[PDB]
UniProtKB/Swiss-Prot annotation, chains A, B:
Family: Belongs to the cytochrome P450 family.
UniProt cross-references to SUPFAM superfamilies, sorted A to Z: Cytochrome P450
Reactions catalysed, as given in the entry: an organic molecule + reduced [NADPH--hemoprotein reductase] + O2 = an alcohol + oxidized [NADPH--hemoprotein reductase] + H2O + H(+); 17beta-estradiol + reduced [NADPH--hemoprotein reductase] + O2 = 2-hydroxy-17beta-estradiol + oxidized [NADPH--hemoprotein reductase] + H2O + H(+); 17beta-estradiol + reduced [NADPH--hemoprotein reductase] + O2 = 4-hydroxy-17beta-estradiol + oxidized [NADPH--hemoprotein reductase] + H2O + H(+); 17beta-estradiol + reduced [NADPH--hemoprotein reductase] + O2 = 16alpha,17beta-estriol + oxidized [NADPH--hemoprotein reductase] + H2O + H(+)
One biological process term in Gene Ontology: long-chain fatty acid biosynthetic process
Gene it is expressed from: CYP3A4
Protein name per Swiss-Prot or TrEMBL: Cytochrome P450 3A4
Disease implicated: Vitamin D-dependent rickets 3: An autosomal dominant disorder of vitamin D metabolism resulting in early-onset rickets, reduced serum levels of the vitamin D metabolites 25-hydroxyvitamin D and 1,25-dihydroxyvitamin D, and deficient responsiveness to parent and activated forms of vitamin D.
Record text on subunit structure and interactions: Interacts with PGRMC1; the interaction requires PGRMC1 homodimerization.
Outcome following mutation: M409T: In allele CYP3A4*3
Post-translational modification: Polyubiquitinated in the presence of AMFR and UBE2G1 and also STUB1/CHIP and UBE2D1 (in vitro).
């Protein structure tokens, strides 16, 4: 109906007037980012809209954002919006709620410490070497390279080896059953017809769940469930995420099925995200030769030509950090951050009813001219140690913020940097005739290039 | 979704471009009649629209209308659009389909013959007398009279006595259990929130039916079911619709439950319809004193003052027939006629896919300036025996047409005429200060005055 559709009107909150049943979902016809940009421009600091019957409050004031993401994380804003239909993946840390979430976050946090990270570096390193060799041969036969294919394959190689201990060159072994399964763990397009229908008829989710219909492919999760079981029967008895998880449940203990839910959600959270960002980075480097050259000069200085990167030397590369951060400013692939008000609240003068989704529009904030000079331009100096103090951590939020921020942030940052270093040590990347310049974005539910980035790759 | 929403586009048929999920239902914001008028003006002869995902083809060419309502009634256009949730009322003749319908129509047709009608006339007559006495006393204490209350009560008195043999003065016995139940059998507002939701989510109807949720009030049908049973146990053993029905099943025979379904649907089809039209007629007569006076003169001529009307004398009153017909031209209370294409068809050059609802917009056609001079004016002479041959029976369709037209047409016409005669013999009807002039129509799903017609009633 429209019973909920008078909420923001009643609170004096501005926003696009909702249609019966649909709410404002027709405003998604150009994707999430364009919707949020336009609403921001038109309504200002705060606006309300409806995903079907679901009220969503967008906030843009960084003190408000602090209150939601940090200060009242545990009291009120603990969970993201409910998500289904799911089966056992209900126990995935990204989907879990309240005490169940707070428990998983505790069990898993030790796994993502820098100390653990540093021990994982040799493994990630090995597939940098693989990425290079794959790159090199796709180059010495001089045709333009599809980044998503080579970085996609890199993204997988690193997850498997660092999570399970499965050591596969996915690019050259694409019909390996493990590869064929895990490669299906792509990000959801919440603007596709199934999810729009679920948004308009959310009362159908329980019907789907009772039939065990789930948006995580059953065949894949079944396969991974069986794989995990056999590896646990290979480790017991005879350095990866699985081992650390195996060891932790070896004590309120990581259940068997819970363990596998986390393994799967890690792939899901890390696979296409990491691939996408690396593609964006290489696009920026290719279209800004001066930046690519300067980055190559830093790498060569820190690592006298082609010395292998280490954890310590990665942390030494300031310009590398700037390029990664500025690319993430332009392309915050989550686009929005979300928390549900689990009870009535009044934050910074504004009353928010229980059940409202409070949304932080990262993409819109990242490109807001009020906080960023020439926001559409790629300018790494934004993040130089001189200019860096100028950056509000509640305006710049590519990994979110607070207790429920990206738990794999450190790993993803390290992963990408190690990829970039090895790749840049060996090659230069340049536009091809069929490089899309300037880059156009998908008008779908995922922040990605409209067409895959294709670059000419030249050996140094 | 919108899979169906490209149908008319594919057939080159014009119409309002549909929204996802909703189709064109937001176009109903001013009711059915205004929607059809506007679409007619804007698209012309034919147009297509979507009630949710359901394609509806509106036709206005009288040869096309003939083909649908008459020529291909049995082959293709046998049923109206499916209607639920219903329980046992599935076997009501108005709701039944195909062979089940064709059977019920045969079993029930003998009941609505003129010969039967004439035998029912004394019974209907008695409640004309009751209507008058009720009117007279509400008048001699001189306050403006709410037509829907007095005609509403008349409408019920005639159904009960002529259908079951229940003889009640409903106006003065409003808490009689029979009255209290039957008075709930009002017409559905298909633009109310429940029906709009069912239109957008028709896949929910079977879920409702398996829980025996039904749009016919269960308490009422239960009561009427029990009543019918006790009267059948009073007739057996020891002139109305029930008796004629009782006698017919006394032989492919009218089942017990089927009998009761028909009794109920008759009330439903006859109660508010008859009341509404009588109210419209009195409104026209009150606002056109010359017409009311001329009608009173005919009645007095045919029935030398206050002689009781008979079947034969009713048929003698030409100006009475003209006034009734012209009121029905202005206010065709069904508004639309509908048939579903049960298979693919090509009528008059135009292909119509199986499953499309073909709709004839009676209200729009009744007020179409191309077929009617000054269509908004009340002009009984339209239907004078001189001008009457000028009337296309597929443009003027207040009772529909073909094998599935209004089976109670004769009865309803006789009923109203007998009411009007008795009422006009005794009173004159005039505007009150709070009479709405000109009359405004409801913007809801039912063709009715926006506010109830209230008239000053004066004894002759
Ligand atoms: C550059 C790549 C990545 C980006 C841009 C990214 C971004 C994000 C963002 C914005 C959130 C939501 C934070 C919030 O709501 O405040 C998130 C959550 C999460 N991410 Fe990442 N992520 C990336 C890679 C990874 C990787 C490699 C992992 C590996 C484990 C991972 C695991 C997770 C998990 C488990 C959550 C949910 C945390 C929770 O609910 O407790 N992500 N990510
Ligand atoms: C002035 C009052 C009335 C008007 C304007 C009216 C009008 C209509 C219309 C337009 C239809 C659809 C015809 C078609 O689809 O071609 C219809 C159907 C029907 N009407 Fe009436 N009606 C009235 C009174 C009555 C009464 C008193 C009865 C008593 C039995 C009745 C019984 C029915 C039935 C059973 C149907 C469905 C017939 C079938 O599907 O076979 N109506 N009516």
């Amino acid at each position: 109906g429209t019973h909920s559709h008078g909420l923001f009107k009643k609170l004096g909150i501005p926003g696009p007037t909702p249609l019966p049943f649909l709410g404002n979902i027709l405003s998604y016809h150009k994707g999430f980012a364009m919707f949020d940009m336009e609403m921001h421009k038109k309504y200002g600091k705060v606006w309300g809209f409806y995903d079907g019957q679901q009220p969503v409050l967008a906030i843009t004031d960084p003190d408000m954002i602090k209150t939601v993401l940090v200060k009242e994380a545990y009291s009120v804003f603990t969970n993201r919006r409910p998500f289904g239909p799911v089966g056992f993946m209900k126990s995935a840390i990204s989907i879990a709620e309240d005490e169940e979430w707070k428990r998983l976050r505790s069990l898993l946090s030790p796994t993502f410490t820098s100390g653990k990270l540093k021990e994982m570096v040799p493994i990630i390193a090995q597939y940098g070497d693989v990425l290079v060799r794959n790159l090199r041969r796709e180059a010495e036969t001089g045709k333009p390279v599809t980044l998503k294919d080579v970085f996609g394959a890199y993204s997988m190689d690193v997850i498997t080896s660092t999570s399970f201990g499965v050591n596969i060159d996915s690019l050259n072994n694409p019909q390996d059953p493990f590869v064929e399964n895990t490669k299906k763990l792509l990000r959801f397009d919440f603007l596709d017809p199934f999810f729009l229908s679920i948004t308009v008829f959310p009362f159908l989710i329980p019907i789907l769940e009772v039939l065990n219909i789930t948006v995580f492919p059953r065949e894949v999760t079944n396969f991974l469930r069986k794989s995990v079981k056999r590896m646990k029967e290979s480790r017991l008895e005879d350095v990866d995420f699985l081992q650390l998880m195996i060891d932790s449940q070896n004590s309120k203990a990581l259940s068997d099925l819970e363990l596998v839910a986390q393994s799967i959600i890690f792939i899901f959270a890390g696979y296409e995200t990491t691939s996408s960002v690396l593609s964006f980075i290489m696009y920026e480097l290719a279209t800004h030769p001066d930046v690519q050259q300067k980055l190559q000069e830093e790498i060569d200085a820190v690592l006298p030509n082609k010395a292998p990167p280490t954890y310590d030397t990665v942390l030494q590369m300031e310009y590398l950090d700037m390029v990664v951060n500025e690319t993430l400013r332009l392309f915050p692939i989550a686009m929005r951050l979300e928390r549900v008000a689990k009870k009535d609240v009044e934050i910074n003068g504004m009353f928010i009813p229980k059940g409202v989704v409070v949304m932080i529009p990262s993409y819109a904030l990242h490109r807001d001219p009020k906080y960023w000079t020439e926001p559409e331009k790629f300018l790494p100096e934004r993040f130089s140690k001189k200019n860096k103090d100028n950056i509000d951590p509640y305006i710049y939020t590519p990994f979110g913020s607070g207790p429920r921020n990206c738990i794999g942030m450190r790993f993803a940052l390290m992963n990408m940097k190690l990829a970039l270093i090895r790749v840049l040590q060996n090659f230069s990347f340049k536009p091809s005739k069929e490089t899309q310049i300037p880059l156009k974005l998908s008008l779908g539910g995922l922040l990605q290039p409209e067409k895959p980035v294709v670059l000419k790759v030249e050996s140094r």
